[PDB]
Write a protein that binds this ligand. Sequence first.
Ligand SMILES: Nc1nc2c(ncn2[C@@H]2O[C@H](COP(=O)(O)OP(=O)(O)NP(=O)(O)O)[C@@H](O)[C@H]2O)c(=O)[nH]1
Ligand SMILES: [Mg+2]
Length: 166
Amino acid sequence: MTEYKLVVVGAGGVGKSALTIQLIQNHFVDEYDPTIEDSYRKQVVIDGETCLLDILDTAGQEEYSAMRDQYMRTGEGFLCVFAINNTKSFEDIHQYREQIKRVKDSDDVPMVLVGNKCDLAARTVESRQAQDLARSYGIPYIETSAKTRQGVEDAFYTLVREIRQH
Ligand SMILES: Nc1nc2c(ncn2[C@@H]2O[C@H](COP(=O)(O)OP(=O)(O)NP(=O)(O)O)[C@@H](O)[C@H]2O)c(=O)[nH]1
Ligand SMILES: [Mg+2]
């Protein structure tokens, strides 16, 4: 069956693992548990296609950068995650995107911009500005909460659908 290699990237603590675990295991992880690199494989039916989600969950820490180039090379699609209560993580997005283009030798890689932690009232990043950034890149913007599961499948499946269209 078709395997879709999805890579989850973004700054430390934005919820890359929480999103992935909510998708695979239907539980919200509220623990402190930094990632080095973890992979998940799940058989799913998306729009009637049977396929295998191979999800590469990456570290937000600069120390794991080289490890970064490796996985970025193999990915077909990228979830670029920031947290809506963390303006620095939103600024960092640009830098993850540019490294993705660099390692993929491509201006146009399947990608979704994900604003996570949308359950929180303490927003510092307006939806408007994330939407603008995503338009500027030519990719969808999806808001998610790993905590409430709002948007979680939407983010992953939308990325699959981007890959299908590339
Ligand atoms: N309220 C809320 N908290 C969240 C959400 N997603 C993650 N968190 C919380 O944020 C913290 C960090 O999440 P985690 O998934 O470990 O983040 P990460 O991006 O994978 N960290 P790293 O780069 O170290 O691996 C955890 O305490 C987690 O429960 C969310 O959608 N809403
Ligand atoms: Mg993690």
